Amino acid sequence: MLTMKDIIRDGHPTLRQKAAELELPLTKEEKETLIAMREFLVNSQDEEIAKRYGLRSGVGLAAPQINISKRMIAVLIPDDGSGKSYDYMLVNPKIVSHSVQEAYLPTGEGCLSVDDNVAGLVHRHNKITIKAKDIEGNDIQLRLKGYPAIVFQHEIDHLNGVMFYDHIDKDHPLQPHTDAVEVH
Ligand SMILES: [Zn+2]
Numbered sequence: 483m484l485t486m487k488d489i490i491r492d493g494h495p496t497l498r499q500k501a502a503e504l505e506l507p508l509t510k511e512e513k514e515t516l517i518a519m520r521e522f523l524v525n526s527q528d529e530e531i532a533k534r535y536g537l538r539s540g541v542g543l544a545a546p547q548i549n550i551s552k553r554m555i556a557v558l559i560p561d562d563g564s565g566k567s568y569d570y571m572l573v574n575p576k577i578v579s580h581s582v583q584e585a586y587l588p589t590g591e592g593c594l595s596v597d598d599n600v601a602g603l604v605h606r607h608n609k610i611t612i613k614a615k616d617i618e619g620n621d622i623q624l625r626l627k628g629y630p631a632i633v634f635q636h637e638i639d640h641l642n643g644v645m646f647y648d649h650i651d652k653d654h655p656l657q658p659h660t661d662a663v664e665v666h
Contacts, residue, residue, distance in 0.1 A: 484522040485535050488548045492596045492645065501546050501553045501641040512600040513617055516554050516571045523558040538594050540643050542633050544640030547595050555637040559630055568630050572614040572622065575638055581609035585628055585663040591646040592637060602650030606635045608663045609666045626664045 490496060496585055504512065528536040545554045555575060559568040585608035590601055610631045612624045626634055651657065658664065 483525065483535070483636030484548060486537060486594075487520075489570055489594050490547060490549050491630065494549070494595075495619050496546055496549050496551055496639070497595055497645065498643040499546070499551050501544075501551045501645055503553055504615075505571070506615055508573065508619070510615065512552065515545070515548075515550060516573070516617055519545070519548065519554070519556040520558060520569075520571050523556055540592075540594055542637045543594070544637045545588065546640050546643075553641045555632075555634075555641070557633055557637060559633060562629070566630075568633075569638060570622070570624070571617050572612075573619075575612050575614035575634070575641075576637070577607075577610050577638065578613050579611045579620065580603075580607035583608045583663060585637060585665050586658065587629070587632060587665050590650070591632075594644055596645065596647070600647045600650065602647065603658060604632075604633050604636075604646050604649040605659050605662055606649075610635065612638075615663065628663070632665065639658070 523540060523543055525526045525531045526539045532539060540600045541559045542557045545552045552626050553574050557568055557570045584605040585604045591604045609627045614622050616622050
């Protein structure tokens with residue numbers, strides 16, 4: 483199983499590189515890796531398991547975070563009471579279209595690759611449409627909004643060597659952009 487010791491931290495060169503496109507079909511190893519990435523999220527969200535292995539809870543993970551420069555991500559967002567949940571392992575995910583209007587989490591964002599918290603709003607697109615392949619090479623096209631849209635953009639950013647704090651304004655980190663959607 484993957485644990486915190488597999489998660490590389492801010493400063494590691496791989497986090498700033500541009501992950502390489504995956505050739506389909508994925509190799510056996512690449513599939514096992516993607517499955518392990520999702521499994522890590524599962525474990526991180528289980529109170530008992532996370533405690534036992536000292537895992538930091540999270541809803542997204544990108545291959546670069548475990549030092550694998552490949553364009554693969556895993557997103558595991560639990561039911562928000564709305565009945566909506568997101569359990570996706572994506573290969574070569576790409577935002578094909580998006581809203582002009584932005585959105586942001588009121589408390590900012592966090593990342594397992596960044597040990598300490600960083601204050602500041604991270605404005606992203608409120609709505610996005612992503613096209614990707616799934617673990618078996620089949621086609622997936624997602625229409626996301628709000629929180630999940632923010633999570634996927636955060637993960638895709640990892641594939642381009644972009645960290646969440648790159649989006650935080652230095653002078654006015656907590657000042658919301660006019661007309662931006664505060665995601666509750
Ligand atoms: Zn992250």
